[PDB]
């Protein structure tokens, strides 16, 4: 029942190069979820870095005990890439801008995109990838070369089998 | 999304107790399950993110993760002398290295003879757009998949647009290669296409980006004289004549 | 939604017998729970109510309540508020404060060399619309924050639009500053935008000249000569040349 | 059971700068609700004051014992801003704060806007603010300038604890 | 309509038995429960019935039954085309009665640097403007100001009645006489730069017979050259023209 515990966990999971982690959502409990970004990361020019979108969204859904659809938003902004994490789908923002066979996406100045956990799971199922736990996790590989930000939503997998009971 | 929450709650809770194992596991999720992504011609390279190579062949038009495709991993060594400054150096040094970059000059001669135009003016006009020469220089295994080059007048604004002709029935563009092509000449657009069972990469203008601010001045008359002094290979000239005749009726993408 | 308001009706009834506590509660509800509001560029400053600041940065484009925003709460020392009369005084006395308006005149000189035109007529034409000089004076800040200023011909209207260039990767427009900009220059529209990873504020003519016509006349020849004897710093001139070259291809919003 | 009691309470709640009230309050019973504004306030040139909309609308619903949807309307007339309070929709525009991302609104000469209590509850829920009594009330910050009138729908909260049970 | 029929049947029958009480009741229903009707600018006065007055103010834009507007009820003193024509003809003798009209004309002549003889001939060619001027300058009025601007489409000169202050109450008798005296002219109320205005333009071509006698423009021009106008009024008209120079006519 720790709102800041989730943000700390997410910051741990996200690589260090993605400067950020601020709340910007106010006090929120697993029952009461905000409409503001729970976490906010940002990268500078040349931040050829990866973001574990599936892991963070599934973790957000785990922490909350109310039905929801965690959502990530990516903005090329004007000088730096901006990742935002909302507990519920925002409005005025493109929903499913990640369609199968369209892993590559480009973002010009002030442009935006995003993805919800429902759309992520549906796309994962359509591709027929392994739905078992930790057998297929999505990763957003972002290259920020101004004025553009080039994203690739690639499903990366495990290297072993670990403990499965 | 409740089934996900159910079958993942136990795992997430068990991971919360040991953050080290969590970081290790998430960092261990670096094996792409989808290496090849389908592409559809005509395809513009602007949609190619870094770390993406293009395999256009009879087996399909597909993009590949630069890290997993075999030919990309087996590069041509450390040919990392692809800096914009070094390309400018080559552009200025064209006068003394006429023997290399032979396809460029042979294509210019063939076009000048085919359209009954002057060679000095054609050299001055093509030299006004050094981005085409930069593209030629990057794509140079110097025989190892040495791409051919055609020059055709450019519609809208523009003196001459370029057609990079890839010989054979296949063409693999390295991910670093595509990245450096897009970065060195930003104002020019690259579109892949096929014509008469020959793969082509069309280079056209997309904004005023000749970099006249940092563009070096190279004498076109001296290059013209050195070209008139060197005898070109008849095979290259005949091949360029055939390529121009075949591509003379090509709708530019 | 009725019975929630009924469960507030009970409270309202219990409170009605003692209006003092009711007024106390109502006045105690003065802490905004929504401090940052997301905005998306291009954004026109006419939609900025008083007591609202604009924070364009890599972390986002967002508007903030002027009373709660930290940098606003520090206020940069307030610097009072330039009265319209004092702004006219500065416009007239510009000749004697050449250093206080050095960026403006240096941009004019750089443009005069850029278009190989005379500086005196350009100065007379730019001063004919003093609202740009008013904007320069208002946004002038002690220290680096001292904003740069470019001048570009105005399409669809008769004169010259202005580009306030903010250096760095962040730009915070104070609520008092923007409010006084909009009040002092009624006939001009201000729109925030981004170009080549640089935040910019475009000032153009709007509403078909709803501006005072009694603006006093300042002699351009005397200022031209005073510029002819004062030598500007080469660094500022080179920076203005670079900014003009970068913004020569900027779609006006 | 006070016909005038509701308007008097509202007048108490509304700040003094909003000169008005005691007007256009057509004869109305707690069961029979009118189609005319129960209260009409107005401000002069240069008034930079706030209006507690949520409190006024909740009070309007309180006084009436029949299902209804209290509504506020704000109109720039060119010479003075006018707030009017109708018990049922006057068939005007739903609102500007209907889009949680467009809290700011400007009104030129003769322009109008408004908001219903249903829209208020919808925005309050979307923003995820605290639904406890008097923990999140919307406020119309109005700045009256010569041509235009600039209003901002800001959700303000309490500064202490209600001391309630 | 079953509920209405059943709840009214008893009353209707009881009244049928006594027609006198029925007539009394029906005639006793003469108390309007809805006095103010909201209007929205731009508003054309053609939609104003004879017994309707306009109280455009900050507290709202509302029309009122001519029988109920308070100031209207105190409009006891307070007529048609006839006296308006007589005044238009005698304009040469009443420069003091129409100072705003002629002073606005002089200021306008200076604003466009045009000649006063042609301006006088053109303004006298549209006597409906003079009729409006006379109507609005009532007994103990607040002399509403009057600006003259060239008229697009139809050719001539349109009028801008500038109402001073932050409120404007147009009497129902005033509106009726304005609409009847100028049939071919359209009147539209609006607001500009926090100033209420009534625009008078040409309408329906030329549905205005020329039964108006001929008035000499040269004599009026000379008498104006002989009368010295009060300072400040000319400056006020200059300011009004400068403020309204950028006004899209509704
Ligand atoms: Zn490859
Ligand atoms: Zn601020
Ligand atoms: Zn009246």
Residue numbers in the entry:
A (entry chain E), D (entry chain C): 14 to 178
B (entry chain F), C (entry chain D): 54 to 306
E (entry chain H): 54 to 131, 135 to 306
What does the publication say?
UL31 is a soluble nuclear phosphoprotein whereas UL34 is a type I membrane protein containing a single C-terminal transmembrane helix. Together, UL31 and UL34 form the heterodimeric nuclear egress complex (NEC) that is anchored in the INM and faces the nuclear interior. Composed of the viral proteins UL31 and UL34, NEC deforms the membrane around the capsid as the latter buds into the perinuclear space. In HSV-1 NEC, oligomerization into the hexagonal lattice is essential for budding.
Interestingly, the nuclear budding defect due to the DNUL34 mutation could be suppressed by an extragenic mutation in HSV-1 UL31, R229LUL31, which arose during serial passaging of the DNUL34 mutant HSV-1 virus on a UL34-complementing cell line through directed viral evolution [reviewed in]. We refer to this mutation as SUPUL31. To obtain a high-resolution view of the hexagonal lattice formed by the NEC-SUPUL31 mutant, we crystallized the NEC185Δ50-SUPUL31 and the NEC185Δ50-DNUL34/SUPUL31 constructs, the mutant equivalents of the previously crystallized WT NEC185Δ50 construct (UL31: 51–306 and UL34: 15–185). Both mutants took the space group C21 with six crystallographically independent NEC heterodimers in the asymmetric unit, SUPAB, SUPCD, SUPEF, SUPGH, SUPIJ, and SUPKL (UL34 chains: A, C, E, G, I, and K; UL31 chains: B, D, F, H, J, and L). The NEC185Δ50-SUPUL31 structure was refined to 3.9-Å resolution. Nonetheless, the NEC185Δ50-SUPUL31 hexamers looked very similar to the WT NEC185Δ50 hexamers, with similar hexameric interfaces. The R229LUL31 mutation eliminated this salt bridge, and in all SUPUL31 heterodimers (except for SUPKL where it was unresolved), the D129UL31 side chain pointed away from L229UL31. The lack of the R229UL31-D129UL31 salt bridge in the NEC-SUPUL31 structure correlated with an ordered 129UL31-134UL31 loop. Importantly, some of the new contacts at the interhexameric interface were mediated by the 129UL31-134UL31 and 261UL31-268UL31 loops that were ordered in the NEC-SUPUL31 but not the WT NEC structures. Therefore, in the NEC-SUPUL31 mutant, there were new contacts at the interhexameric interface that could, in principle, stabilize the NEC lattice in the presence of lattice-destabilizing mutations.
